Amino acid sequence: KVRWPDFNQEAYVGGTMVRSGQDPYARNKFNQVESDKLRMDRAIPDTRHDQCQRKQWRVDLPATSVVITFHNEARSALLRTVVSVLKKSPPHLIKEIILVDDYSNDPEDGALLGKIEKVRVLRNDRREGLMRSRVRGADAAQAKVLTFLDSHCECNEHWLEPLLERVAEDRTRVVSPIIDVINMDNFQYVGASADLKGGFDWNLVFKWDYMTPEQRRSRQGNPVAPIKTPMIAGGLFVMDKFYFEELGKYDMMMDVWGGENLEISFRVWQCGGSLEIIPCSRVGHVFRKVFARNTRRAAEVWMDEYKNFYYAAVPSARNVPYGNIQSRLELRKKLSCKPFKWYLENVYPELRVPDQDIAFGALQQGTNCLDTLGHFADGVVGVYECHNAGGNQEWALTKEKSVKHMDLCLTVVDRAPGSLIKLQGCREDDSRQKWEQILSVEV
Amino acid sequence: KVRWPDFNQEAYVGGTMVRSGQDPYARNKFNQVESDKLRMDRAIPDTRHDQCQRKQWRVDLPATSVVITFHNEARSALLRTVVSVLKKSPPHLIKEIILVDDYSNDPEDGALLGKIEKVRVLRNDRREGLMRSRVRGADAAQAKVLTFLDSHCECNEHWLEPLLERVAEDRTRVVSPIIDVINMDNFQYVGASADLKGGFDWNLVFKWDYMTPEQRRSRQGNPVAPIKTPMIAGGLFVMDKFYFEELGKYDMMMDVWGGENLEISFRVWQCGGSLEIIPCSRVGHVFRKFARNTRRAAEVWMDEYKNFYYAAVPSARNVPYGNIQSRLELRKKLSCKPFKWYLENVYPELRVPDHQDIAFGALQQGTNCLDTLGHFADGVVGVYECHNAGGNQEWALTKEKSVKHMDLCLTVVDRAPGSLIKLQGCREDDSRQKWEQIEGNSKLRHVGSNLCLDSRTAKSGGLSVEVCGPALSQQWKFTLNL
Ligand SMILES: O=c1ccn([C@@H]2O[C@H](COP(=O)(O)OP(=O)(O)O)[C@@H](O)[C@H]2O)c(=O)[nH]1
Ligand SMILES: O=c1ccn([C@@H]2O[C@H](COP(=O)(O)OP(=O)(O)O)[C@@H](O)[C@H]2O)c(=O)[nH]1
Ligand SMILES: [Mn+2]
Ligand SMILES: [Mn+2]
């Protein structure tokens, strides 16, 4: 067993370096020459709010089993992940670090990290992917609380105490750090915004957005308070171990190319827990950039009818075979989880839910986009380039066949081609406001 | 006195029509030829939401005194305003209509309408303006509730009872209809949005804006409920007569040029009343196309925040505005709340610069604005056409010299020319985040460098840092400058 500072990084990253000519993004989708240049404990900026830095963190907290899962991870990045945990965490709070080597090409990527204090390595036989690899890691953990990280993260100062404080207080909380960004081309560590919450559109791809100005204003008194989130990124969180178990771990027939965020985020909220982002906890993550099977498996279990709006948004998924899900279904009733309606209403109210529009989003043409120009009733309407967007470029075509923004409708004021169209109050039976898929007017 | 239906509109109107060749816009800045063709009680669409078409008010509502003030109004428009009040309002709720002719060139405009049932006319002596004219009318009013309208309005079906119900239930409510649009060219009557709230930017110019999504969401249960509003348009409103008096009427030193929304809206909210837009009340208004009145409002009500207005309108700082003691004494007497309380509780969606911000608002290059492009940390930044809806075009230049949006800051990741700037978490100690306005706030340069913000690759990669130079791609001005 070696203490982390005495581990031989030069040797370990030694023979795996990018060879002249070869493509540094090739193995990984990030720049390995840049990764390999970094020391395993390289200094990173303290990105935490000023208030965190003056906090006295409790350390009379339950220890954690840190589970890190990986498949042909760059050696420099894997080691850097492990050492950030060991350097930045109170040693009595790290029971162990469990590395699940999920079929890497050189088992030595993992096994060599086995000489480090607290690290134990489990190797999969075939490639099982992230979700089952985590379940296995979790099954082997000896501590009361689980911490899951990706194999290309860098923990910041006092990242762990604020997370464990939460779950030690109430074991139904599944909590996450603010995920700082490590740039995939130059490996600079970048402070993220603390004003974000996790969410998604009806295609179900995870996305961030800012809290509303009202939510921010409500936090002014304690701006480092926990943030409740509809969904976690999924790569990094901490969860009470028995809670992870009792709620059903992860779905064992998910495969990769999987969204580790989706199903667990719905289950936790519907089945009585909460998801939080904890501002004082900062961990960096290298961000970069068939899939449908896993998403299907989540939707079919958790969303009830609103699953329809997903298939609406992504018809391309309607017949990807997704397999047997009965044991996941049994699980939901066994737990007496609330319905998806409740989650939309209570957890993600700000998600736009459809219903009977013929069409939504922007009216393109094809560089530009229909735009109110900020005009109201009796104003002309126009185009700007598409910004992607929302606001004055968002429109609906209604069951009633109107083209509307808020309650204003494009109105044929004068049939004479091609005089100007106008915004006017939407009128269910006004015929000057009816449009069909087949500014000013013309033939 | 004459039944409104018995009034001869052709005699009244016909005596002032536009003649051969003469500009039909000259007199009023609207098309008088189109106005004059209309019947005095012309049919207008019912723009009210279907859910109005019950609906909800007591049986013993209080009568109102309607006050309409005018200077050289087009006779046809004036007459339609009066007949629409008479035609659309239950007769027992109209105690009287008081016309204040604020020194119109021809006194017959008003005096001939004095033959109509319930109308009485007062002529100003001299040109007093709308505010002083309104106080004169209100002082004459015999009923318990005041209704103010402009002289180019057309009331719609059951416009009055929902206004009267609000104030009969709580006399500290000052209430307005949804104001429908009467087009100044063709005089067509156009239904307005019901999703608006009144407001203003730091230049103190009134504007509408859509409610927030959460506000809309909280109205699912009753989409025609009252709408609380930080500011009223000011032309049209109903107010308990005694409450109008007790609260200080209007500031009697306001002149012609105002501006009638501002001072009263701040005073009502700060002194414990409220302002509402009532969706089931619909009235049309002919819309068409100075700092003394605004200063008198800012100096009395705004406390330190008046400084943002002066920032926005630096020329206002010179302008005489007269004596405000009486108003400050009114403010103390009524125990009004500070402007800070108003911004927090009444209008939290106005975004307010930090006390030590150096500049604020949009950062404009011609008609384009610095836009985050929906990006977050480690993302590039760019420009779009300035849309004045804020959001991704909202910025501040802070005490710490950063250009910031939410808690992200423009960061110079590489000093090499043509290097892209990036959004990173603001950190006070980060020298890469420090920027300064130069050359009369026409450009932004990275502190301690020869590098300036540049748009040349806006659309093919992002904004960059580039050697400072005459290029127009390096011009940037904040809309607000402290
Ligand atoms: O246990 C694992 C962990 C990761 N990966 C692979 O490594 C890459 C990164 O996935 P991960 O979720 O670790 O990182 P992300 O890029 O999703 O943040 C993908 O090709 C995964 O399939 C894997 O096969 N098994
Ligand atoms: O009592 C009045 C009413 C109106 N006006 C003038 O009439 C014009 C339009 O004002 P109003 O408020 O009637 O209409 P709006 O501002 O809505 O167009 C302006 O020149 C005002 O000075 C006036 O001098 N005294
Ligand atoms: Mn990752
Ligand atoms: Mn008017």
Bound ligands, named by name, code or SMILES: uridine-5'-diphosphate, manganese (II) ion
Q: Which percent band covers the strand fraction of chain A?
A: 15-25%
Predict the CATH topology of the largest domain in chain A.
Answer: Spore Coat Polysaccharide Biosynthesis Protein SpsA, Chain A
Number of helices of chain A: 14
Largest sheet of chain A: 5 strands, mixed
The protein's oligomeric status is: homodimer
Q: Quick one: overall form of chain A?
A: elongated
Radius of gyration of chain A: 25 Å
Please give the alpha-carbon distance between the first and last residues of chain A: 81 Å
User: What's the CATH class of the largest domain in chain A, please?
Assistant: Alpha Beta
Largest interface, C-beta closer than 8 angstroms, per-chain residues:
A-B, 42 and 45 residues
Q: Which structural class fits the helix and strand makeup of chain A?
A: alpha+beta
The neighbouring-strand order within the major sheet of chain A is 3-2-1-4-11
Task: Tell me the count of domains of chain A.
Answer: 2
In percent, how helical is the residue content of chain A?
A: 25-40%
**Count the strands of chain A?**
18
Give the CATH superfamily of the largest domain in chain A: Spore Coat Polysaccharide Biosynthesis Protein SpsA, Chain A
